[PDB]
Enzyme design. Structure first.
Site, PDB file in Angstrom:
ATOM      1  N   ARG A  93      37.183  25.311  35.303  1.00  0.00           N
ATOM      2  CA  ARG A  93      37.943  26.311  35.811  1.00  0.00           C
ATOM      3  C   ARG A  93      38.093  25.512  37.112  1.00  0.00           C
ATOM      4  O   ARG A  93      37.922  25.240  38.022  1.00  0.00           O
ATOM      5  CB  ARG A  93      36.860  27.418  36.090  1.00  0.00           C
ATOM      6  CG  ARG A  93      38.333  28.587  36.845  1.00  0.00           C
ATOM      7  CD  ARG A  93      36.711  29.702  36.233  1.00  0.00           C
ATOM      8  NE  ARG A  93      37.636  30.744  37.253  1.00  0.00           N
ATOM      9  CZ  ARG A  93      37.450  30.850  38.592  1.00  0.00           C
ATOM     10  NH1 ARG A  93      35.847  31.132  39.236  1.00  0.00           N
ATOM     11  NH2 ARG A  93      38.325  31.936  39.189  1.00  0.00           N
ATOM     12  N   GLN A 185      37.410  37.569  41.674  1.00  0.00           N
ATOM     13  CA  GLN A 185      36.645  37.920  41.939  1.00  0.00           C
ATOM     14  C   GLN A 185      37.862  39.643  42.597  1.00  0.00           C
ATOM     15  O   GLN A 185      38.009  39.613  44.293  1.00  0.00           O
ATOM     16  CB  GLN A 185      36.273  37.897  43.722  1.00  0.00           C
ATOM     17  CG  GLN A 185      34.985  36.845  42.620  1.00  0.00           C
ATOM     18  CD  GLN A 185      34.350  35.687  43.842  1.00  0.00           C
ATOM     19  OE1 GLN A 185      33.215  35.239  43.826  1.00  0.00           O
ATOM     20  NE2 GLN A 185      34.540  36.163  45.474  1.00  0.00           N
ATOM     21  N   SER A 188      36.806  40.935  46.358  1.00  0.00           N
ATOM     22  CA  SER A 188      36.866  40.310  47.861  1.00  0.00           C
ATOM     23  C   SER A 188      37.859  39.946  48.486  1.00  0.00           C
ATOM     24  O   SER A 188      37.773  40.921  50.156  1.00  0.00           O
ATOM     25  CB  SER A 188      37.640  38.591  47.212  1.00  0.00           C
ATOM     26  OG  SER A 188      36.149  38.002  47.075  1.00  0.00           O
ATOM     27  N   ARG A 257      27.317  41.375  42.031  1.00  0.00           N
ATOM     28  CA  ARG A 257      25.784  41.265  42.716  1.00  0.00           C
ATOM     29  C   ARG A 257      24.516  42.132  41.743  1.00  0.00           C
ATOM     30  O   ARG A 257      25.254  43.019  41.485  1.00  0.00           O
ATOM     31  CB  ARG A 257      25.965  41.549  44.043  1.00  0.00           C
ATOM     32  CG  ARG A 257      26.703  40.250  45.157  1.00  0.00           C
ATOM     33  CD  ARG A 257      26.315  40.871  46.465  1.00  0.00           C
ATOM     34  NE  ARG A 257      27.521  40.705  46.791  1.00  0.00           N
ATOM     35  CZ  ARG A 257      28.738  41.408  48.617  1.00  0.00           C
ATOM     36  NH1 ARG A 257      27.727  42.175  49.193  1.00  0.00           N
ATOM     37  NH2 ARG A 257      29.074  40.133  49.120  1.00  0.00           N
ATOM     38  N   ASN A 326      31.052  36.310  38.435  1.00  0.00           N
ATOM     39  CA  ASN A 326      30.738  35.193  39.479  1.00  0.00           C
ATOM     40  C   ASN A 326      29.416  35.583  39.469  1.00  0.00           C
ATOM     41  O   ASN A 326      29.924  36.954  39.977  1.00  0.00           O
ATOM     42  CB  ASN A 326      31.865  35.515  40.763  1.00  0.00           C
ATOM     43  CG  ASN A 326      33.130  34.697  40.002  1.00  0.00           C
ATOM     44  OD1 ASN A 326      33.322  33.584  38.893  1.00  0.00           O
ATOM     45  ND2 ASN A 326      33.920  34.206  41.099  1.00  0.00           N
ATOM     46  N   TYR A 328      26.358  34.842  42.887  1.00  0.00           N
ATOM     47  CA  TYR A 328      25.420  34.142  43.656  1.00  0.00           C
ATOM     48  C   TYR A 328      23.789  34.890  43.959  1.00  0.00           C
ATOM     49  O   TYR A 328      23.626  33.269  44.212  1.00  0.00           O
ATOM     50  CB  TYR A 328      26.349  33.815  44.194  1.00  0.00           C
ATOM     51  CG  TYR A 328      26.880  33.034  44.651  1.00  0.00           C
ATOM     52  CD1 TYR A 328      27.474  31.557  44.620  1.00  0.00           C
ATOM     53  CD2 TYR A 328      29.502  33.444  44.402  1.00  0.00           C
ATOM     54  CE1 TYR A 328      28.902  30.689  44.391  1.00  0.00           C
ATOM     55  CE2 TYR A 328      30.060  32.676  43.204  1.00  0.00           C
ATOM     56  CZ  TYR A 328      29.745  31.230  43.766  1.00  0.00           C
ATOM     57  OH  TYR A 328      31.123  30.788  43.670  1.00  0.00           O
ATOM     58  N   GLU A 407      31.340  31.454  38.038  1.00  0.00           N
ATOM     59  CA  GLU A 407      31.092  30.116  39.206  1.00  0.00           C
ATOM     60  C   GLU A 407      29.562  30.900  39.449  1.00  0.00           C
ATOM     61  O   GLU A 407      28.706  31.549  39.345  1.00  0.00           O
ATOM     62  CB  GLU A 407      31.438  30.492  40.665  1.00  0.00           C
ATOM     63  CG  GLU A 407      32.859  31.060  40.684  1.00  0.00           C
ATOM     64  CD  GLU A 407      33.471  31.553  41.873  1.00  0.00           C
ATOM     65  OE1 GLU A 407      33.313  31.410  42.792  1.00  0.00           O
ATOM     66  OE2 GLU A 407      35.144  31.131  41.794  1.00  0.00           O
TER      67      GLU A 407
HETATM   68  O1  NTZ Z   1      31.308  30.488  49.078  1.00  0.00           O
HETATM   69  C1  NTZ Z   1      31.725  30.056  47.511  1.00  0.00           C
HETATM   70  C2  NTZ Z   1      32.671  30.435  46.767  1.00  0.00           C
HETATM   71  C3  NTZ Z   1      34.150  30.311  47.066  1.00  0.00           C
HETATM   72  O2  NTZ Z   1      34.416  29.246  47.652  1.00  0.00           O
HETATM   73  C4  NTZ Z   1      34.893  30.396  46.646  1.00  0.00           C
HETATM   74  O3  NTZ Z   1      36.321  30.667  46.749  1.00  0.00           O
HETATM   75  C5  NTZ Z   1      34.741  32.418  45.864  1.00  0.00           C
HETATM   76  O4  NTZ Z   1      35.526  32.291  44.070  1.00  0.00           O
HETATM   77  C6  NTZ Z   1      33.341  32.797  46.583  1.00  0.00           C
HETATM   78  N1  NTZ Z   1      32.716  33.695  46.385  1.00  0.00           N
HETATM   79  N2  NTZ Z   1      31.947  33.935  46.581  1.00  0.00           N
HETATM   80  N3  NTZ Z   1      31.400  32.603  46.976  1.00  0.00           N
HETATM   81  N4  NTZ Z   1      32.241  31.940  46.395  1.00  0.00           N
END
Ligand code: NTZ
Ligand SMILES: *[C@@H]1O[C@H](CO)[C@@H](O[C@@H]2O[C@H](CO)[C@@H](O[C@@H]3O[C@H](CO[C@H]4O[C@H](CO)[C@@H](O)[C@H](O)[C@@H]4O)[C@@H](O)[C@H](O[C@H]4O[C@H](CO)[C@@H](O)[C@H](O)[C@@H]4O)[C@@H]3O[C@@H]3OC[C@@H](O)[C@H](O)[C@H]3O)[C@H](O)[C@H]2NC(C)=O)[C@H](O[C@@H]2O[C@@H](C)[C@@H](O)[C@@H](O)[C@@H]2O)[C@H]1NC(C)=O
Ligand SMILES: *[C@@H]1O[C@H](CO)[C@@H](O[C@@H]2O[C@H](CO)[C@@H](O[C@@H]3O[C@H](CO[C@H]4O[C@H](CO)[C@@H](O)[C@H](O)[C@@H]4O)[C@@H](O)[C@H](O[C@H]4O[C@H](CO)[C@@H](O)[C@H](O)[C@@H]4O)[C@@H]3O[C@@H]3OC[C@@H](O)[C@H](O)[C@H]3O)[C@H](O)[C@H]2NC(C)=O)[C@H](O[C@@H]2O[C@@H](C)[C@@H](O)[C@@H](O)[C@@H]2O)[C@H]1NC(C)=O
Ligand SMILES: *[C@@H]1O[C@H](CO)[C@@H](O[C@@H]2O[C@H](CO)[C@@H](O[C@@H]3O[C@H](CO)[C@@H](O)[C@H](O)[C@@H]3O[C@@H]3OC[C@@H](O)[C@H](O)[C@H]3O)[C@H](O)[C@H]2NC(C)=O)[C@H](O[C@@H]2O[C@@H](C)[C@@H](O)[C@@H](O)[C@@H]2O)[C@H]1NC(C)=O
Ligand SMILES: *[C@@H]1O[C@H](CO)[C@@H](O[C@@H]2O[C@H](CO)[C@@H](O[C@@H]3O[C@H](CO)[C@@H](O)[C@H](O)[C@@H]3O[C@@H]3OC[C@@H](O)[C@H](O)[C@H]3O)[C@H](O)[C@H]2NC(C)=O)[C@H](O[C@@H]2O[C@@H](C)[C@@H](O)[C@@H](O)[C@@H]2O)[C@H]1NC(C)=O
Ligand SMILES: *[C@@H]1O[C@H](CO)[C@@H](O[C@@H]2O[C@H](CO)[C@@H](O)[C@H](O)[C@H]2NC(C)=O)[C@H](O)[C@H]1NC(C)=O
Ligand SMILES: *[C@@H]1O[C@H](CO)[C@@H](O[C@@H]2O[C@H](CO)[C@@H](O)[C@H](O)[C@H]2NC(C)=O)[C@H](O)[C@H]1NC(C)=O
Ligand code: NAG
Ligand code: NAG
Ligand code: NAG
Ligand code: NAG
Ligand code: NAG
Ligand code: NAG
Ligand code: NAG
Ligand code: NAG
Ligand code: NAG
Ligand code: NAG
Ligand code: NAG
Ligand code: NAG
Ligand code: NTZ
Ligand code: ZN
EC number: 3.2.1.147
Lengths: 499, 499
Positions: A93, A185, A188, A257, A326, A328, A407
């Protein structure tokens, strides 16, 4: 029966126990990047991440770093392909910089043929190595001219300029690209770009951050979010009506999340947790699946929430072939007041929740995700089970979508020397623990997930952090950026992919 | 009777023989700067020198250096004042960055109050130290949005956007600023920005430089020059009709050179030399004094030369209270063909002259001015008598104008270490030799010159050279830019000013 670990130590780095063969044969594995973060400014116009990082250097990162040269993927795109080839990745990607192919923003002002050739060569080189491109049209790098003409996504003029840009991308690259992402995202930019002003363009209410040049944190996130949805949807309709011959698929990207109650026997915390799902995920997923915002948002946000006309609702509802999710981390949620009359009110306050990584009995949700050296109580912690909970929730709440995890990754500090940085066992642990749960949710819940792209291919400019953190599965020396050298995590991922 | 030296060695660095008391008591002495070169991007929008240096890094300088941080006069403006105070200077020429006070280009889009406050504090601090500001409205740093909306000075839309910007400057600063410059060096953007593409915005014909994004070197210099004249003149009319209460003066800045025949007994070389005066100086001075371009330009350039309407001619003619004349060097001129049908034709070819620093008998015109290490036959040499010839010519040809010498200076290599750089005897020699001739032409020819501003206050980002050359009378360490330390030349100029 699959068992996955939630706490250190992890043992999922043993490819005898977890590997690509654990997943369906067609499953795509790779890595992700974005254009501002990797290419450099050579050969392109200027965008609002250039503008923001230059006008507000202390918001670019602690080091005041920016994307001016970064890892020079403009020059070294072939070295990016070589990483992917070394990994035996089947997906990559990346994003197209709007300012590289239409430096003047509006397509009628002309295109940059050399910019178009840069992506053509990258795409061709990926396909020649058996790597499926997943191409993000808009990873936040709006041409500065559009921000200065009409404040970008603040104005409905964005819709047609974004559509003409996307049309150019489909026309030039869609013969080879079969997976498109519209906006990275959706949550964001509205919140960070127009709420807290942590991100470009850096608008907010005066008392939120006196450095913002203009804005209103209470209203503008909603305007921007609404225009993003309409712009996205216009692009998806264009794709599906005018480019169906290309045989590809398109979708938005969500930041996901999970949310858990700060106190799981306290009705107020439980309610805050459900509000967070609606305000964080439903803000966009309600429109995308139903053509309307969540009822709790309608009720709370009131006149600050734009309406969709019947035509707009129809355009937005169903405007995806798949979702790029995405993921995290996960947060605990507890109640918080919503002071709508305060001069420092932000849209993010409307959810009526305070988010933490520690619950009411003092439990930290999982291993360290990001240390905050200025305030250690603000450290982020990760939660591997969250990817299972998210995917399960999307299947159940949002009509069993096709999903690609677009991601997932973790940083290590830029203060580490090269040897420490290459011995990134913490990244193996993060990646493997999430992949364990991803396999587990596909098997147990039958979620239609068909690929996984780890953040990031290589070290890059990290939004908000400069070069003070590293996310790559391959290491880049900032004194000589040519090489991308696989770290322990890249080496591990190579074996996971081809065990 | 005044005798001035033309060749090394010079002896004019002895303030017993040449000093400020050699000039009239009211004569202004100081130094000059420009905003892109000294401030940094913090606190301002992006302009076409940001855009150009980022898109075409190898044209920014050999080091790929740019104005992102430079000497940080945004932060350290007081240290600039302290240099001026140390010098006992009575004048300082600086420029206002359009992108600092109207980041969005067009005034109706809003102003940057903090940007306005930055110039207010600088102006107040200068006046408090008895330093007269000479303020350039436009030293090339056009807001990028204007270039991207309509290609900046290529389009007549620039006229009203420049006028609204200037009006803002007069309204905010004209109570204190009494000397205004409109556009720095009228010749430079048309030729370098739109002809050779050495300078922002970097437009040219495809075969001139394949890297240019667009352009036409044969036509666009003339369009741009014409719009500069009209924009200048509209601003001067605004100033003189709406701000006469401020009791100040306004003018353009010209880059001046003298020209001598390559062979002073060859009629063809003599003719080329006179053509150069018309094409280099008269291109702008004809309109400014007569409302028309020189006849030789009308004849040669033909349909590529725009016409002034009677209203426009009247606006432009006489549109100055004084002239800011920049002077650095002189060239020999010899005939050269003008291949108007060649795909690589440039406007600069229309003069029908080739320019050198060596004449037909092998004489180099004067001491070294700039070494070119890639090709030593392309070194530039200076000619102190040229300032006398220029001023004399302006008095005689252009109606005895009031003149301020708004730039004059010389570089030393950035490869020198600090000690060598501080022992800048070559700069004393250049400055003093020109000041000798300037005093001589005022006394002998009665040219109405009333001040002299040496280039530059301090080391800065040099257009086209990055940090690979230094022009300052004060030294700046690029590893820690806070201090500006007077070099031997600054120390000499201090004694010249207050002998
Ligand atoms: O912080 C790590 C990555 C950024 O590098 C990515 O550009 C972004 O899409 C993102 N959103 N949440 N975490 N990330
Ligand atoms: C999926 O999309 C569905 C729409 O395609 C959502 O269903 C809509 O939900 C609306 C509430 O959000 C509901 O609208 C209400 O209709 C009331 C009934 O009006 C009819 O008769 C009136 C009734 O007395 C009359 O005035 C009208 O002219 C109609 O004849 C009504 O008053 C409500 O308005 C008040 O509340 C809204 C806030 O909700 C205020 O903004 C408004 O000023 C007023 O104070 C509301 O009317 C809507 O008001 C705003 C205006 O812009 C809208 O066009 C108007 O519709 C609507 O009836 C249904 N539509 C249908 C077809 O069911 C569905 O909502 C979920 O499910 C519904 C059943 C309900 O439980 C919602 O709370 C749930 O969110 C969406 N699903 C999801 C999961 O979001
Ligand atoms: C200072 O500004 C003065 C103007 O305010 C300049 O004087 C003008 O100079 C013009 C030449 O550049 C000159 O114009 C020529 O007029 C010819 C005479 O026309 C009248 O009678 C015609 C004559 O037979 C008729 O067709 C007309 O309608 C008028 O009745 C004429 O043909 C010339 O045109 C040819 O040449 C021009 C190129 O010069 C071509 O562009 C044109 O297509 C044609 O091929 C020219 O006419 C001008 O043509 C272009 C059009 O846009 C203009 O409006 C039209 O005027 C003009 O007569 C004088 N004006 C006066 C009031 O003297 C003065 O020029 C300098 O001094 C003059 C004497 C001359 O020596 C010039 O060469 C010198 O430059 C300017 N001074 C300086 C120092 O530049
Ligand atoms: C998870 O949330 C639960 C539910 O909210 C917390 O349990 C509640 O904790 C309250 C104290 O924060 C308890 O109320 C107190 O009860 C004693 C006995 O009468 C009293 O002296 C207190 O004044 C207080 O009473 C409240 O006063 C405010 C009034 O408006 C309200 O009507 C009164 O209830 C409450 O009884 C308890 N509820 C339940 C069902 O147990 C829980 O808090 C943790 O457990 C409780 C038992 C107690 O040990 C707290 O110290 C301990 O924090 C919370 N868990 C955590 C880890 O925070
Ligand atoms: C400064 O410019 C002057 C004027 O142009 C140069 O002097 C001229 O130099 C010409 C050679 O470049 C001389 O012409 C030549 O004369 C000899 C004698 O007949 C002949 O054999 C040559 O073919 C040539 O003749 C010309 O051929 C081309 C025809 O179209 C033209 O009609 C013929 O004239 C010319 O006589 C001379 N003019 C004058 C007034 O002296 C001068 O050149 C320098 O001085 C001359 C005397 C000579 O020594 C050249 O070698 C020497 O370069 C030039 N100065 C410099 C330093 O370049
Ligand atoms: C944010 O924009 C909103 C809407 O224009 C402003 O909120 C309004 O505040 C005006 C003045 O108090 C009120 O009359 C309205 O009742 C409010 N409208 C709503 C929808 O809340 C708000 O003040 C602006 N915030 C900032 C910091 O400028
Ligand atoms: C520069 O623009 C000019 C004017 O549009 C072009 O010159 C013309 O060339 C066209 C095609 O040859 C001709 O028909 C005209 O006779 C020319 N006009 C004049 C005023 O010269 C020129 O080709 C363009 N140059 C580039 C490199 O694009
Ligand atoms: C892959 O992991 C599976 C368990 O999911 C295991 O059965 C298989 O042996 C492993 N493959 C290799 C080559 O180790
Ligand atoms: C960062 O920069 C802004 C100017 O953009 C200034 O307002 C702010 O105080 C600075 N931050 C810190 C922590 O110094
Ligand atoms: C389709 O392409 C045609 C031709 O360029 C265009 O005019 C039509 O409006 C487009 N459709 C969309 C978004 O449906
Ligand atoms: C404004 O909010 C900040 C953080 O959101 C908080 O510290 C402060 O209490 C708030 N001020 C008012 C007046 O509510
Ligand atoms: C930079 O890295 C590349 C790849 O390792 C190497 O070939 C080149 O010599 C290196 N240059 C320097 C100056 O280190
Ligand atoms: C590439 O992956 C394919 C598919 O699993 C496998 O057959 C091939 O051996 C792998 N190549 C390498 C070099 O690992
Ligand atoms: C200044 O130079 C003049 C000559 O122009 C000389 O007469 C005078 O003495 C010098 N002043 C001082 C203080 O040296
Ligand atoms: C400089 O950069 C341009 C791309 O902007 C390229 O066309 C040119 O060849 C490079 N110059 C040299 C001397 O390499
Ligand atoms: C003068 O200022 C007035 C009022 O703002 C303006 O409307 C008028 O047109 C201006 N004049 C110029 C350039 O003469
Ligand atoms: C184009 O001009 C360049 C330099 O201006 C020159 O080297 C070359 O001879 C010219 N080419 C043609 C075809 O005239
Ligand atoms: C930088 O220069 C300023 C002025 O000399 C000095 O006060 C400051 O300590 C210096 N900082 C470093 C790190 O050299
Ligand atoms: C400043 O210059 C003035 C005017 O010539 C002179 O009277 C005064 O002594 C000078 N001050 C210094 C410190 O040189
Ligand atoms: O090169 C030295 C200086 C530049 O630094 C100035 O910005 C410019 O006005 C100029 N023109 N000619 N020489 N100069
Ligand atoms: Zn930069």
């Amino acid at each position: 029966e699959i068992t996955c670990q939630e706490n250190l130590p992890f043992t999922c780095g043993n490819t005898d126990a977890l590997n690509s063969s654990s997943f369906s044969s067609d499953f795509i594995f790779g890595v992700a990047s974005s254009a501002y973060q990797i290419e450099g400014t050579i050969g392109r116009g200027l965008n609002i991440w250039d503008g923001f990082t230059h006008r507000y250097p202390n918001k670019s990162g602690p080091d005041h770093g920016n994307g001016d040269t970064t890892c020079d993927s403009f020059s070294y795109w072939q070295k990016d392909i070589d990483v992917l080839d070394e990994l035996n990745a089947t997906g990559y990607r990346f994003s197209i910089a709007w300012s590289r192919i239409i430096p003047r923003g509006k397509r009628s002002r002309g295109v940059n043929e050399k910019g178009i050739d840069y992506y053509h060569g990258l795409i061709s080189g990926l396909i020649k190595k058996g790597i499926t491109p997943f191409v993000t049209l808009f990873h936040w790098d709006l041409p500065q001219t559009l921000q200065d003409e009409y404040e970008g996504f603040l104005d409905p003029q964005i819709i047609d300029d974004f559509k003409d840009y996307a049309d150019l991308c489909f026309e030039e690259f869609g013969d080879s690209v079969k997976y498109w992402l519209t906006i990275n995202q959706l949550y964001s930019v509205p919140t960070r770009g127009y709420g807290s002003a942590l991100d470009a363009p850096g608008r907010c209410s005066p008392t939120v951050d006196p450095s913002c040049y203009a804005g209103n944190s209470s209203t503008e996130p909603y305007i921007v979010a609404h225009h993003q949805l309409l712009a996205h949807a216009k692009v998806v309709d264009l794709y599906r009506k005018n480019y169906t011959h290309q045989g590809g698929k398109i979708g938005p990207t969500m930041i996901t999340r999970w949310f858990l109650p700060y106190n799981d026997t306290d009705r107020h915390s439980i309610a805050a947790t459900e509000r967070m799902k609606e305000f964080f995920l439903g803000w966009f997923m309600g429109p995308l699946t139903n053509g309307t915002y969540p009822q709790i948002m309608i009720d709370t946000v009131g006149e600050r929430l734009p309406s969709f006309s019947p035509e707009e609702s129809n355009l937005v509802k169903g405007s995806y072939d798949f979702l790029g999710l995405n993921y995290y981390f996960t947060q605990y949620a507890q109640p918080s007041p919503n002071p709508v009359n305060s001069t420092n009110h932000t849209a993010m306050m409307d959810a009526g929740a305070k988010l933490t990584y520690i619950n009411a009995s003092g439990h930290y949700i999982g291993p360290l995700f990001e240390k905050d050296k200025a305030d250690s109580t603000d450290n982020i912690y990760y939660y591997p089970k969250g990817i299972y909970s998210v995917m399960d929730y999307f299947k159940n709440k949002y009509y069993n979508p096709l999903i690609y995890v677009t991601e997932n990754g973790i940083s290590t500090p830029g203060d580490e020397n090269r040897n420490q940085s290459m011995l990134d066992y913490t990244r193996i642990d993060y990646l493997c623990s999430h992949l364990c749960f991803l396999n587990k949710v596909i098997k147990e819940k039958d979620v239609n997930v068909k690929g996984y792209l780890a953040w990031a291919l290589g070290d890059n400019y990290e939004f908000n952090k400069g070069f003070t953190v590293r996310f790559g599965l391959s290491y880049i020396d900032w004194n000589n950026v040519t090489d991308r050298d696989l770290k322990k995590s890249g080496q591990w991922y190579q074996s996971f992919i081809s065990p």
